[PDB]
Amino acid sequence: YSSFQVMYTVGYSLSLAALLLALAILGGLSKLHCTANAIHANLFLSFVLKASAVLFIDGLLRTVSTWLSDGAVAACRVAAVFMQYGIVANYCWLLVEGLYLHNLLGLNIFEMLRIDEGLRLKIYKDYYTIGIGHLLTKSPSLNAAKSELDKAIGRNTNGVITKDEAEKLFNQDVDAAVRGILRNAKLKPVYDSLDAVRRAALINMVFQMGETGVAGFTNSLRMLQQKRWDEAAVNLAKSRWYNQTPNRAKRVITTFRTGTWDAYPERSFFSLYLGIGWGAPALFVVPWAVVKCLFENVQCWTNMGFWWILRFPVFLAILINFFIFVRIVQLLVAKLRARQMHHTDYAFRLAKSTLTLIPLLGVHFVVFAFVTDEHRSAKLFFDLALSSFQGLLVAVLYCFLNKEVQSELRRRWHRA
Ligand SMILES: COc1ccc2cc(-c3cc(-c4cc(Cl)cc(Cl)c4)nn3[C@@H](C)c3ccc(C(=O)NCCC(=O)O)cc3)ccc2c1
Ligand SMILES: CCCCCCCC/C=C\CCCCCCCC(=O)O
Ligand SMILES: CCCCCCCC/C=C\CCCCCCCC(=O)O
Ligand SMILES: CCCCCCCC/C=C\CCCCCCCC(=O)O
């Protein structure tokens, strides 16, 4: 146990140093402020909580529990709760990581317009409109709109259509928008000198206000053509288009400003991530801390530390992760086959870390769960020794090896 104690001490302390360093890096570099890095930071924090609790409990008990004093039992129990909380939070944030990557892979111009326009199988005022944001006519007459709809679909729809017909209209409208940009003299050079995400951001506006409607922001076009994203964002915020549809304009403007899909899907969607990563563990850990304090309030509530009963929420988090994992793979090979992306892409590089971490941590937890119930000490010491380094592994995979992080570090180094 002496060697085992030394090994997990080195593992958790090294993990803690690396995690605090990674947190200082993500927090201190403003250009790295994306949703993915906020998720990584919260994951880092959960491991920081775990490692801090482990090192503290270890200092209090192994540097016994039958005769602990009033302050000792208190600090020890608080540390035990924080340890359990950190352990469940690890897997819940790995789950959030899988969710974010999965949603990121599904994002494109199609999904973006699909979020900003929705899908209405019946005609509605936006001007009469149906399907996914498809204009019918600006004429007040309802029959005049229904006529254009029935003519466009080639049948008596009576103002009601199917989803297949709607998306069929959708693909055409996207094609027409892109051709409208390419034919335009004042829009094409701007579109050519743009990354795929911002190109989609321009196509959004063309899909909403037509070709000439976006052509009318030439003073705002030259700015993003000059890569002055900030002032372009401000001037776009000043525009009448912002006053008419602020909620959509914010997402598009931030898509121009950040060059990321972070605006999508929706604002405060991150609160769900917070609820899963921090709240969900609280839902299971708090009541069981209550049961511990009420009925098993002995020693330090000290399975090698982790509470037995808490397996199952983690199991749940792992189970869901499995289905996410599979889906992600299916998207990846799809995007690679269609050449919609390649290995230098951010989604792929994120997948390199997340798709290793999910099976690694999941299989490790399942193995731990089976071994702890065998009533085996060798397998426990080995797996826990290696598991102590997991915070270091996460910090390395999500931060230190990250291309944007290293690029920013090289840039700040080169500026000097
Ligand atoms: C697309 O699907 C997937 C899924 C899993 C994948 C897993 C690996 C892989 C190969 C190896 C390995 C290990 C040894 Cl000892 C020797 C040799 Cl020769 C190779 N490690 N790993 C993992 C451990 C890994 C390595 C780097 C990064 C990274 O660089 N992240 C940061 C990227 C960034 O942000 O720029 C993240 C994981 C590679 C592609 C993958 C692709
Ligand atoms: C018990 C301690 C652990 C619980 C602490 C939880 C408190 C919230 C912590 C971090 C909040 C992170 C919010 C960051 C928003 C960034 C959004 C973005 O960049 O897209
Ligand atoms: C300081 C870097 C910036 C990031 C801030 C993250 C918030 C820090 C949260 C907890 C810090 C505790 C780490 C030290 C624990 C030591 C445990 C021990 O000495 O036994
Ligand atoms: C007792 C509760 C058990 C819960 C089990 C959960 C099983 C399903 C969990 C996650 C499923 C997510 C699959 C994502 C498919 C998205 C489709 C797409 O990518 O377009």
Curated annotation (Swiss-Prot):
GO biological process entries: adenylate cyclase-activating G protein-coupled receptor signaling pathway; adenylate cyclase-modulating G protein-coupled receptor signaling pathway; cell surface receptor signaling pathway; cellular response to glucagon stimulus; cellular response to starvation; generation of precursor metabolites and energy; glucose homeostasis; positive regulation of gene expression
Outcome recorded upon mutating residue 85 to A: Abolishes glucagon binding. Strongly reduces expression at the cell surface
Record carries keyword Lipid biosynthesis: no
Cellular compartments per GO CC: membrane; plasma membrane
Annotated consequence of substituting residue 301 to A/H: Abolishes glucagon binding
UniProt keyword annotations, A-Z: Cell membrane, Diabetes mellitus, Disease variant, Disulfide bond, G-protein coupled receptor, Glycoprotein, Membrane, Phosphoprotein, Receptor, Signal, Transducer, Transmembrane, Transmembrane helix
Outcome of swapping residue 356 to A: Loss of synthetic antagonist binding
Post-translational modification comment from the UniProt entry: Ligand-binding promotes phosphorylation of serine residues in the C-terminal cytoplasmic domain. Phosphorylation is important for receptor endocytosis after ligand-binding.
Keyword Oxidoreductase listed: no
Membrane-spanning ranges: 1-24, 37-61, 78-101, 270-291, 307-329, 354-372, 380-400
Recorded consequence of changing residue 300 to A/S: Abolishes glucagon binding
Consequence of changing residue 353 to A: Strongly decreases affinity for synthetic antagonist
Residue intervals annotated with topology Extracellular: 292-306
Residues in compartment: Cytoplasmic: 25-36, 102-269, 330-353
Effect of residue 12 to A: Abolishes expression at cell surface and glucagon binding
Subcellular location field: Cell membrane
Region described as Important for allosteric inhibitor binding: spans on this chain: 353-356
Disulfide bonds: 76-300
Family: Belongs to the G-protein coupled receptor 2 family.
Disease cited in the entry: Mahvash disease: An autosomal recessive disorder characterized by alpha-cell hyperplasia of the pancreas, hyperglucagonemia without glucagonoma syndrome, aminoacidemia, and occasional hypoglycemia. The disease may lead to glucagonomas and/or primitive neuroectodermal tumors.
Note in the entry: Selective recognition of glucagon over glucagon-like peptide is determined by residues located at the N-terminal end of the glucagon peptide.
Role, per record: G-protein coupled receptor for glucagon that plays a central role in the regulation of blood glucose levels and glucose homeostasis. Regulates the rate of hepatic glucose production by promoting glycogen hydrolysis and gluconeogenesis. Plays an important role in mediating the responses to fasting. Ligand binding causes a conformation change that triggers signaling via guanine nucleotide-binding proteins (G proteins) and modulates the activity of down-stream effectors, such as adenylate cyclase. Promotes activation of adenylate cyclase.
Protein name: Glucagon receptor
Provenance organism: Homo sapiens (Human)
Upper classification of the organism: Eukaryota, Metazoa, Chordata, Craniata, Vertebrata
Shown residues within the full chain: 138 to 417 of 477
